[PDB]
Amino acid sequence: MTHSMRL
Amino acid sequence: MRHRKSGRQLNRNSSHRQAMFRNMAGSLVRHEIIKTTLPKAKELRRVVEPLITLAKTDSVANRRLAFARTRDNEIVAKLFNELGPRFASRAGGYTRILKCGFRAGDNAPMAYIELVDR
Amino acid sequence: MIQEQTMLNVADNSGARRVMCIKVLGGSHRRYAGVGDIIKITIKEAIPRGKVKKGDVLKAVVVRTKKGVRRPDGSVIRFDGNACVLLNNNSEQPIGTRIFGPVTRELRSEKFMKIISLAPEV
Amino acid sequence: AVQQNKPTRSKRGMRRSHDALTAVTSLSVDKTSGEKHLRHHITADGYYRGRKVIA
RNA sequence: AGGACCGAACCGACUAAUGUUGAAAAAUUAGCGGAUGACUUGUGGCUGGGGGUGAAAGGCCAAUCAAACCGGGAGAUAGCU
RNA sequence: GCUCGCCGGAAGACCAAGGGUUCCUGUCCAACGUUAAUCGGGGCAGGGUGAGUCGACCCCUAAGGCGAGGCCGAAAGGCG
RNA sequence: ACACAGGUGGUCAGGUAGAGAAUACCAAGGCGCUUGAGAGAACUCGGGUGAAGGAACUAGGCAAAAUGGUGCCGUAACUUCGGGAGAAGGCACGCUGAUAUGUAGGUGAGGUCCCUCGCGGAUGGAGCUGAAAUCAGUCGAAGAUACCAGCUGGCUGCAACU
RNA sequence: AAUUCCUUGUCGGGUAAGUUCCGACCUGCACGAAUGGCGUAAUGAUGGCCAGGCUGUCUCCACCCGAGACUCAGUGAAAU
RNA sequence: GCUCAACGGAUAAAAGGUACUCCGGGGAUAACAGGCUGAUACCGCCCAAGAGUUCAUAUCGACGGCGGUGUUUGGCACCUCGAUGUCGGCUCAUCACAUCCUGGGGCUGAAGUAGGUCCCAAGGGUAUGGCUGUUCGCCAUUUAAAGUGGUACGCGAGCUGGGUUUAGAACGUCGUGAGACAGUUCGGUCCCUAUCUGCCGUGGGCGCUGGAGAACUGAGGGGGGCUGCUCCUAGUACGAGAGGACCGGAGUGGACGCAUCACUGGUGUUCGGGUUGUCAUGCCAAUGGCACUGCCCGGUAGCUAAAUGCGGAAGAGAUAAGUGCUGAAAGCAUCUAAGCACGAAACUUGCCCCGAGAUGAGUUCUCCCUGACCCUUUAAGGGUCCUGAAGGAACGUUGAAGACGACGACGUUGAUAGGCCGGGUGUGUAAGCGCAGCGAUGCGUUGAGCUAACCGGUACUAAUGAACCGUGAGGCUUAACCU
Ligand SMILES: CC[C@H]1OC(=O)[C@H](C)[C@@H](O[C@H]2C[C@@](C)(OC)[C@@H](O)[C@H](C)O2)[C@H](C)[C@@H](O[C@@H]2O[C@H](C)C[C@H](N(C)C)[C@H]2O)[C@](C)(O)C[C@@H](C)C(=O)[C@H](C)[C@@H](O)[C@]1(C)O
Nearest to C87 by CA among C16, C5, C34: C16
Element (H, E) at D3: none
Residue B108's nearest nucleotide, by CA–C1', is: G37
Contacts of C97 (CB under 8 A, 6+ apart): C12, C13, C118
> Are the C-beta atoms of C93 and C111 separated by less than 8 Å?
yes
DSSP per-residue string spanning B38-71: HHHHHHHHHHHHHHHHHTTS--HHHHHHHHHHH-
DSSP string, C45-108: EE-TTSSS-TT-EEEEEEEE-SS-EE-TTS-EE--SS-EEEEE-TTT--BSSS-B-S---GGG-
Residues C88, B22: Cα–Cα separation, whole Å: 71
Give the distance from residue B100's alpha carbon to the nearest chain D alpha carbon, in angstroms: 5
Way the structure was solved: cryo-EM
Nucleotides of strand F lying closer than 7 angstroms to a protein CB: 3-5, 35-36
Q: What are phi and psi of B46, to 5 degrees?
A: -65, -15
Q: Note whether C95 and C10 are within 8 A (CB).
A: no
Pairwise CA distance, residues B29 & B76, whole Å: 9
CATH 1.10.238.10 for domain C1-122, yes or no, is no
Q: Domain locations in chain C?
A: 1-122
Atom from ligand 1 closest to the CA of residue A2: 18
Instruction: Measuring from the CA of residue B19 to each C1' atom, give the nucleotide at the shortest distance.
Output: F4
CA angle C64, C47, C110 (to 5 degrees): 40
For chain A, how big is the Rg over CA atoms in Å?
Answer: 4
